[PDB]
Amino acid sequence: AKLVFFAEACIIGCMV
Amino acid sequence: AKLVFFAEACIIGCMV
Amino acid sequence: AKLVFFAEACIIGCMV
Amino acid sequence: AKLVFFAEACIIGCMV
Amino acid sequence: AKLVFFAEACIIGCMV
Amino acid sequence: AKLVFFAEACIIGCMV
Amino acid sequence: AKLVFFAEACIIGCMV
Amino acid sequence: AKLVFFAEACIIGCMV
Amino acid sequence: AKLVFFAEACIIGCMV
Amino acid sequence: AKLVFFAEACIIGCMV
Amino acid sequence: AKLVFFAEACIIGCMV
Amino acid sequence: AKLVFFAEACIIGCMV
């Protein structure tokens, strides 16, 4: 898997 | 734009 | 305190 | 949105 | 001074 | 190239 | 509060 | 769980 | 050992 | 190689 | 000592 | 110059 940083703008990293 | 580290506790970054 | 990086996934730092 | 780490060398992050 | 992250969107930290 | 935070759980950034 | 990377050169993040 | 930075030296963050 | 982020506040990562 | 963080100011990581 | 980021590629920070 | 991560232990990045 990959650690992905999204941000709806606040940012958060999530493991996918 | 800037990246703010709102940590209001936890820390999240967002721009302005 | 400490700065825990909870991985509940998603990583968030929080002061504990 | 995502944060990409274009490192094309140096590293810079940008969203999509 | 402060280390400030701006991003014209690619991000870069700079000491101000 | 792009730099992805790999995962499989430890995380490493690598070049691609 | 906000978390700023202080500087004066070393950098530290602190709560405000 | 939380992210642990092991020191094997070298530093690897792992989800524990 | 582990790298632990103390909130001595200001964030400082130290070994233990 | 190594990952130098040049502070020419502004911080950029580059593979050297 | 110093924390040096090796590009062993993948980025790994190690002590020296 | 470049950012050096001193290990005094604890880790402080300083502009050198």
- Which residues on chain H are in Cβ contact (under 8 Å) with K12? 10-12
Which of G4, G5, G15, G16 best tests the I interface by mutation, with the highest count of I CBs <10 A?
Answer: G15
Q: Can you tell me the distance from the alpha carbon of J10 to that of D14, in angstroms, rounded to the nearest whole number? A: 16
Method used to solve the structure: X-ray
- Which residues on chain H are in Cβ contact (under 8 Å) with F12? 12
Instruction: Please give, rounded to a whole number of angstroms, the shortest distance from the CA of I12 to a CA of chain H.
Output: 14
Instruction: Please give, rounded to a whole number of angstroms, the shortest distance from the CA of B3 to a CA of chain E.
Output: 5
Q: Can you tell me the distance from the alpha carbon of L4 to that of L15, in angstroms, rounded to the nearest whole number? A: 6
Q: Can you tell me the distance from the alpha carbon of H7 to that of G10, in angstroms, rounded to the nearest whole number? A: 23
Q: DSSP letters along B1-16, please?
A: --EEEE---EEEEEE-
Instruction: Please give, rounded to a whole number of angstroms, the shortest distance from the CA of K9 to a CA of chain J.
Output: 8
Alpha-carbon distances of G6 from D3, E1, G15, I2, rounded to whole Å: 24, 6, 10, 25
> C with L: 3 or more CB pairs under 8 Å?
no
Q: What part of I 1-16 touches H (C-beta under 8 Å)?
A: 1-4, 13, 15
Q: Work out whether the CA dihedral H13, H15, I5, I11 comes out positive or negative.
A: positive
Q: Can you tell me the distance from the alpha carbon of F10 to that of H5, in angstroms, rounded to the nearest whole number? A: 9
Q: Can you tell me the distance from the alpha carbon of G4 to that of E1, in angstroms, rounded to the nearest whole number? A: 10
Q: Resolution (in Å) of the shown entry? A: 2.2
- Which residues on chain G are in Cβ contact (under 8 Å) with I13? none
Nearest Cα residue to L4 out of F4, K16, F15, H13: K16
Say yes or no for a CB contact (<8 Å) between F13 and K9.
Answer: no
Partners of residue D15 on adjacent β-strands: D3
